[PDB]
Every structure is written in structure tokens, then in C-alpha cells.
Amino acid sequence: PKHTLDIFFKPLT
Amino acid sequence: KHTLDIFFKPL
């Protein structure tokens, strides 16, 4: 699957 | 000719 990591590590504006 | 059937039987 994809992007299951996005939920844990978000992009820090 | 070819196989082992001629040389080895069941039993």
C-alpha cells in the first residue's frame, strides 16, 4: 500500500 | 530403446 508512513512523519513547515 | 522399465519391474 502507500503513504502509511505519512501519518507518522509529517512535513514540518 | 530408452527406459528403465525394461530392467526394473513392480515389486
Added chain:
Amino acid sequence: PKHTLDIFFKPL
């Protein structure tokens, strides 16, 4: 490319 050596070494 090709035959560049043909100019230094020719049949004897």
C-alpha cells in the same frame, strides 16, 4: 570509427 587503423597498418 571504422578502418581508422587501416591507415597505419596496410597489407604487406
Added chain:
Amino acid sequence: MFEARLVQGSILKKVLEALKDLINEACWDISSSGVNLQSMDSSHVSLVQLTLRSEGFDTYRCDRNLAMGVNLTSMSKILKCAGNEDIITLRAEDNADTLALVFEAPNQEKVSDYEMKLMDLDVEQLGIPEQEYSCVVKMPSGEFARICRDLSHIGDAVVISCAKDGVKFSASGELGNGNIKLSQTAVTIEMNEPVQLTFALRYLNFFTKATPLSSTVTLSMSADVPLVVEYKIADMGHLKYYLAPKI
């Protein structure tokens, strides 16, 4: 001026060697504290993070933070031109669009100079909180590597589990099921709560191309959260991989 001299150049080959398989391009953040690099794999399931502290190089000089976008495949290919016993030195100019790598042979007779082209990466730095993990497993890196190559032949997913002071990876597929029970022995297990996850073996098998870097790997895990697979580098930094559980 960026310049960094690494006497043990093999480290840098093994590093590229380990990144390249997981990701093609990433941005190398250079600063006085050293080298930092971070990126998710292209399908955002995993993430790699490298740190190489300025302490760890034999020569280090950074005049201004910089951020080079590197094609990791290209750089790995250039690094293959380094002998495993070469002094490797990296070097970058003003806002320059290139990275020079210098390989010097121990003797002192051969010096190789390469200029790698850089690229524009518009990447967004991701935030990585440090937390306390339920089970923490230190083991030999080769064992870890072999465990994962093994279960790979049985199915696509490994169920990592810690019970009474002991860990186990399991898997199943067409051929049948199997599991592998490690015991606290050098295998060190730090458990404060039993834990149980499933991960994509395909990614772990990418992770284990960092094996040549350390005799040791530590797996860190907690319910519902990324697995962290770490390889400490010499006395220089680390290389960490993070992996989302299988839903």
C-alpha cells in the same frame, strides 16, 4: 567552501550502497554539525535517515549550510571508482551545481578526481520525534539479514513478536509457515511490554543492505508505530530506517 575528508572511505561506499537501493535521489544537508540526509521511499512506506557527524571526519569545514540534491545512483556509481582502502574527500563550492569527490590511494601514487552533477530537489524536511519503545532488540546484523532473507522465501510479511524475554519472526505462504525464535544471549532484548507487528519483508530486505556498516543492528518497536532499524556507524553517526506496520 564545503570540504570533508574521510580516511576510511569504505564507509561512504557502503553508505551509498545502502541508500541507493531504497531511494534514487535525496538532498544532502551539510552544516557545521555534519551531514544529514533524510527521505521516504517513493511510495511513502518507509524512510531512511543518515547522520554523519563532523566529529567523525578527519577534516571538516563548512562555511555555510548547504543542501545538495544528489542522484544517489550516480553517486554510488562514482563511489565504485574508489578503492576500498582509499582516502575519500568531498568538496563543494559557493552555490555550485556540482560535487567533487577526491580518491587518494594509501601509497600516494594514484589520485582520482570526479565531478558529479547535482540536481534540483524541492524536498520537505520531515519531523521525526524520539520516543520510548516497548521492545528493543540488539542482535548481530548478519543474523537479522539472514532471518529476513529466509522468511522472504516463505511469504511477503514478517510478524515480529516479543514474549517472555525473547523474540520471534514468523511468516507463511504457498510452501507452508515458519518461524524463528531468537533468545536473549550477542542478542540483547530490552522489553518493558510485549509487542506484536507485521511488516513488509520487501522493505526489510532493502534495509539490510546497510549490514556491511555494522556488526550490530538494533530493532525498536511499539504497538501501532514505525519500526526503527538502526545501524550505528563506526564512531561517526548512524543510519536509521523506519517502517510503517502493515495495516
Added chain:
Amino acid sequence: MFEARLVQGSILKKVLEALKDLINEACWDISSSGVNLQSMDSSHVSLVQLTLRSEGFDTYRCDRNLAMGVNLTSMSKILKCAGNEDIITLRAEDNDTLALVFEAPNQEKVSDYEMKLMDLDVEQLGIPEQEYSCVVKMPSGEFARICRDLSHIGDAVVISCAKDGVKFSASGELGNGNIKLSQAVTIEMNEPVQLTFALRYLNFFTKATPLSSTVTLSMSADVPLVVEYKIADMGHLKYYLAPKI
């Protein structure tokens, strides 16, 4: 109940490498005296027989004789997961599947593979004891290289046992080749023999090579060749090849 614990796991690894390429499925007959397997390849031109005696095993128990039908490709796949110094126990229930337990040679780590067992319609075949007219015992590496070399040349080898020693011959587009071996090589003749065989099968048989530093070749006029690899006094792997005609 079957349980068989083997200290040198490598043996089983290599036995399974040797089988899997010749055949695909085969019935392992487990009994009180040991482990027995005997099958032909798809064409029936070649047979192999495997014997592993109970005394070869550090432990071994078998309550009711049994006859397990096993995918050999799959078993060898599972076995690729045993290390070369691992200690392998096989284990099966009275009347379904096969455990394989691999134990780290010393440092503790154990692995537990379970594989299914397919219903197999095999019939036992009789090998009528025979005294061979020519028996050759030579280093196994050397035999492997001869079959490998000659197979570059042609697909058949003519094997010639004569007073002197023994000659192997083949030919094709590249040319002709023969190799002569004289008398560690011992030849034990009785009436000279010439036969022709398909190199394809011989190159399968030589996959047993890691099992033993020697091989014995047995021939008589117009009967199947026997290639044999002894397995450290716990038994052997025997292969039979019918004469290319």
C-alpha cells in the same frame, strides 16, 4: 511419530539439492531402520535411490512405518533456510505434514518450518542385485568435470572400460573429444564394456558431488549404469541410467 535429529544438517541440504533437479516429487519411506526414497525422473530413463540409516542420526525414533509424499522443490526451498552447521530434526505425526527444526550450531536460535505433504501414487520398483562387469572408483570432482567438459562437445558420452583403464568420448560441431583415465583411481574390470549415455542425466547425477569426494561407476553390457555417492557411513545416493539407444 517420527523424529530424526541430524547433527550435520548440511547433509540434508545437499541431498535435497541433488534430488530436486532430477525429480520434483518423491515419497520418503520412513521406517525403523532409516529413511528410504526411490524414484524415477519424468521420462523413466533415470532412477535414484536414497538411503539414510538410523545409526547416522544423533537421535531417531519411528513408531509406525510411514510413507511421506513430498514436493522436493519446496523441501529444498525450506532447507535453503538451514545454515550449513545447523542441526536439523524432521518430525511427523502418526498419520499430514512435516516439521523441520533447524538449530543454531551452538549459539541458540531455532527455526520451525512446517510443510504440507501431497498425496502421491507411487509404486515400488525392483532392482535385481547384479555383479557388474566393470567398476570404477574415482574422485567425484574429476567425474563431474568430465561430464561437464564433454557436454560442451556433444550430448552423448561413450564410456569404454578396457584392460588399460577407462575412456570417455563425445563429438559434435566443435569436434571430437575423448578422455582417458588409467589406474585415486581404481578400475576393476572383468570383460571389457562399451556403452553410450546421455550427458544431460549425468550432469544431474553429479549434483550429488558435494556429498562425497568419491564416486563409483558400475557398468555391464546392455544394462543401466549405476552412479553412487556414499554418505559418510550413514548410507548413500544411487543413480541409474538406461543406455542411450
Added chain:
Amino acid sequence: MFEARLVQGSILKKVLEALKDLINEACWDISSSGVNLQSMDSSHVSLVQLTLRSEGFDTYRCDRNLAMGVNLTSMSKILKCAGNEDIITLRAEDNADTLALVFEAPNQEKVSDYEMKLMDLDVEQLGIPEQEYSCVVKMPSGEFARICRDLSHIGDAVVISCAKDGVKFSASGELGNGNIKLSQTAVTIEMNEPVQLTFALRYLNFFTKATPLSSTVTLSMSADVPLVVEYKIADMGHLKYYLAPKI
């Protein structure tokens, strides 16, 4: 007839590996002074010259000059059935329709006889006028093979330059560019005047297939005329390759 028995059969195996990659077919000129072979590659950009003197065989008989047309692909397939320790004999009758290669184990316990069909090959031997060289470079063969293999991940041409105490190999391509600098001390340089030439690396990588015959290699260059790349064989000859500069 012609009969020649070579104790180190490994030399022939190596010679043949290093020829078949460059050329598929050649005439083997057998005389009483030894074996001479010579051939341009198909694209007529380079030539191999192989010399094997009679003194280097423990037995050597040539009753009449001979010209054998050999499919070197096929001879090398056959030479593979020889051990590296094998003694190799070569034997042909002065009517050259076949060539026998006999391979004998040192203990003599095993003897292999192979028969190769020889070929019809019209070839006009070529003249290599006498050449003296501005720059001759003697250096470890394996070092020179590494230089070629590597630069060839960078580009397909190499500029080679002598100018002082050293020589520089340069290449450049899509990834970026690179050069390698060699200095003196077992690298030597007899430089009479500087010189700079460009060569196709694809061919040099063919040449380097001879690398196992010798642990040194010599390059010879003068302005605007073929590079000479030469590997010595034992005490008994050499394999010289020649290559035409980039236009």
C-alpha cells in the same frame, strides 16, 4: 608436422580468453621460431599481435611453416576442458585440416585428446613499420584495468596525457566528469616529450582481458599514431594490442 608441448597450459587458456573477445577468427603462423598470430578486429580499429617463442615450450617441432585458420571462439570453448595445471600439447600434420589439443594432468593419470576442425582463412599479413615512442608507461596491469573499467562508467573515451612525472586519464559523460593521475614509484614513465591522445575505452577493456598473463603492462604513445598496449607472457613472449586514436 608440428608438435609443441607447453608445461603451463594456463598460458594458452589465458591467451585464448584474451583473444576471443577481440576477434572471432585468426591465422596461427607456426614456424620453427615459434607461434606468431596477428589480426585487426572486425571494425578495423585495433589489432592484436601474439608471440610465443619455441624456447618457452619444453618440446617444440615445426617441420614446415604452417598457417592455421582457427575459430578462436571454438578453441577457447575447448581450452576450457583443460585444467590450469594441465600440460597442453598442440599438434598438426603439415597438411593442416585439424589441430589436436592434448591435455595432460601433471600426475599423468588423466589425458584428454580434442580434435578441432581448422579453417580456410585468406588473410593479408600486415606491416607494422618500425616505431619509436615519446611516452612509454610501465604500471601494474590490474591498476590499469581498474582505470579503464572505472572511467568507462563515466564516459566512452579516455584522454591520456603525459606531461611531466605523471600521466592522467580523463573521461566525461552524463554523470559528470573525472580524471586519474598517476605519479612515479611500480609505476614508471619514460617521457621524452609530452603527448595527449584520445581512445575508445570499449577497446581498452577488451585488451585488459589479457590482464591475468602478467602483473605489469606497458603502454606506448607518440603523437598521432596507434597506442601500444603490451602484456609480456612468462619469459616466452607477449600479447601486444594496438589502437587507433579517436579520429
